[PDB]
Nucleic acid binder design. Structure first.
Lengths: 178, 119, 60, 45, 84
RNA sequence: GGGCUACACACGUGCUACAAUGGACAGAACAAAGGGCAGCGAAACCGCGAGGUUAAGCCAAUCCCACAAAUCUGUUCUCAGUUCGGAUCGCAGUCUGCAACUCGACUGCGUGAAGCUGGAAUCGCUAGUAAUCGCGGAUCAGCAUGCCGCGGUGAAUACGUUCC
């Protein structure tokens, strides 16, 4: 909750002076994060896609749900049924308890990483990010999982423009390649 | 995982255990352990709660995994944009140091295959 | 071109490293022992001729 | 460094923190000293 | 090389020196490829005598310790029959 | 100045390994022969190393090249692409030479290919031979996995002329 108090006292007042706001009260707000698994099956016979689903319980406490395909693909499995990947939509106090782990711990842990996200902005608001290691998340043990599985994060901004959406992220302490 | 060089193994003595680090080799490990005074110690992984940290600092002075990969990468990229001839050998599949090509030198060339006959 | 070669050698080289060994009896370069400055074949024919002691041949 | 949060485990030791990581901690030299030396600085007399 | 030091034949030295002090003449042939590039030599473009034909060579700031003749390969590629 | 060193590949011939009869570390111990004055160059000192500084002695059964290596004795790793092997390459040095890019050798550091004994087929050798470990020389400014020698350790089998 320390991150949650942080924008209630530090970020917002500074954000208010950076440019004018209609009706004073208006301020961009984080909405939902969506973590993707993908897995890739390779090919369909994981055999246990659910074993990957258990792994995501560590990255976030919200229960993952498998994303069943709504369309068949000629190049890869499969027609509808036998779900591929998983999805999570953490909210509330969980939102900043998770984001606090992201800046302070997750991103710096990565080897080659120093900073990203420049062209990444939609020009509308939403942020996107890729995650390629479970070593990135401290709660996971090294002994578990063995083979690497992919991950994603998508922060949402209330702001109607990326110029406002970006400035909100900078005060959060989010890294940028610059 | 891990405290110094990332992903050092387990159930092995500390010297070979950090030779695996992309940076330190054998003799360099002999030097950092000479600074350590560990005496080997420990066959498995059990060093000491704080000594692991002070060794983590000395290893931190040495540099550095994937960035060291960036050193060689930026170096060869410096060796190709420069003209060149050395990076030219780097991408011909030609050995760079200078050791013919009429026989062997398959380290870059690969195995298969063959496309000639006479007569 | 052996006359041109011996003429090339008897003349002083621009650099001291240049002076390769060669026998006087024959103008052939290469495969000339430095210690005696003779041709292997030069020394062969002189060996059948016998120039130095001694025994000759294939002892020990 | 210590941090008070919440987890399944009562205690969580952590190898790396933002207060220790060189990037988050301003612009510490850490080990580089990037660009030393490039693209040229080679002279000896 | 070794120590004291890199060794130009020395005619290129006075040539690039006079070209640096004045005139700023560009493109000049040389047969002596053995000479190493120097900081005073920077920015010049030399036709390099591979043997068959001179190959002009610009000098970027990045190149110094590399031999001047190294940049131009005498070798002709490849040559091979059925590519792909 | 190049090229004789090409490079998609084939073949001939060597070298190094694919490892616990082993690897690595420490200690200890046994040679022969050959070369050396435009040379060998000790010892002392500097550098992790290569070598350098300086310099005694030796025209040599005197002195130098020069320390033999396998081995033995212990410590350690405990069966794996490994503390197996070293390839390839990067960086930083070093010897020789007017000069080491093409196209030299060596060292320090770093990188750690392939290969876990090899199809069809094929070679050598009857004892100090095969097996294997080091050393020297001719060559030679520098460059010897090649060649020529030196010694260490040191077997198995030979019923026989059916067959090649």
């Amino acid at each position: 909750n320390r991150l949650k108090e942080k924008y209630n006292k530090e970020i917002a007042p500074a954000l208010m002076t950076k440019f004018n706001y209609d009706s004073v009260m208006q301020v961009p707000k984080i909405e939902k994060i969506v973590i993707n698994m993908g897995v890739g099956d390779a090919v369909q016979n994981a055999k246990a896609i659910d074993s990957a689903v258990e792994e995501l319980t560590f990255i976030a406490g919200q229960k993952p749900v498998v994303t069943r395909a709504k369309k068949s693909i000629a190049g890869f499995r499969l027609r509808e049924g036998m779900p591929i990947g998983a999805k999570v939509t953490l909210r509330g106090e969980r939102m900043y308890d998770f984001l606090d782990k992201l800046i302070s711990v997750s991103l710096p842990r990565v080897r080659d990483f120093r900073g990203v996200s420049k062209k990444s902005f939609d020009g509308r608001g939403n942020y996107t990010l890729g995650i390629k290691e479970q070593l990135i998340f401290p709660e996971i043990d090294y002994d578990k999982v063995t083979k690497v599985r992919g991950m994603d994060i998508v922060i949402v901004t209330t702001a109607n423009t990326d110029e406002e959406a970006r400035e909100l992220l900078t005060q959060v302490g989010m890294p940028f390649q610059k | 995982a891990r405290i110094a060089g990332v992903d050092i193994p387990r159930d092995k003595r500390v010297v070979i255990s950090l030779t695996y680090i992309f940076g330190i080799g054998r003799t360099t490990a002999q030097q950092v352990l000479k600074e350590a005074g560990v005496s080997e110690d420990t066959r498995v992984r059990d060093l000491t709660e704080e000594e692991l940290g002070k060794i983590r600092d000395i290893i931190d002075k040495l540099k550095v995994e994937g960035d060291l990969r960036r050193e060689v990468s930026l170096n060869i990229k410096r060796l190709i944009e420069i003209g060149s001839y050395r990076g030219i050998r780097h991408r011909r599949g030609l050995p760079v140091r200078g050791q013919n090509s009429k026989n062997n030198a398959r380290t870059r060339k690969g195995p298969r295959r063959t496309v000639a006959n006479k007569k | 071109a052996k006359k041109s070669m011996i003429a090339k050698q008897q003349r002083t080289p621009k650099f001291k490293v240049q002076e390769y060994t060669r026998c006087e009896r024959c103008g052939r370069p290469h495969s000339v022992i430095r210690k005696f400055k003779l041709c292997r074949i030069c020394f062969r024919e002189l060996a059948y001729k016998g120039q130095i002691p001694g025994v000759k041949k294939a002892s020990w | 460094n210590e941090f008070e949060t919440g987890s399944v485990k009562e205690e969580v030791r952590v190898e790396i923190c933002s207060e220790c990581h060189p990037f988050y901690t301003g612009r510490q030299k850490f080990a580089s000293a990037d660009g030393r030396v490039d693209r040229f600085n080679k002279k000896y007399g | 090389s070794l120590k004291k030091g890199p060794f130009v034949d020395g005619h290129l030295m006075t040539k690039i020196e006079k070209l640096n002090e004045t005139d700023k003449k560009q493109v000049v042939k040389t047969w002596s490829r053995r000479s190493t590039i120097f900081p005073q030599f920077i920015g010049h473009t030399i036709a390099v005598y591979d043997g068959r034909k001179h190959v002009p060579v610009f000098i970027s700031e990045d190149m110094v310790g590399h031999k001047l003749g190294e940049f131009a390969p005498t070798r002709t590629y490849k040559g091979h029959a059925s590519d792909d």
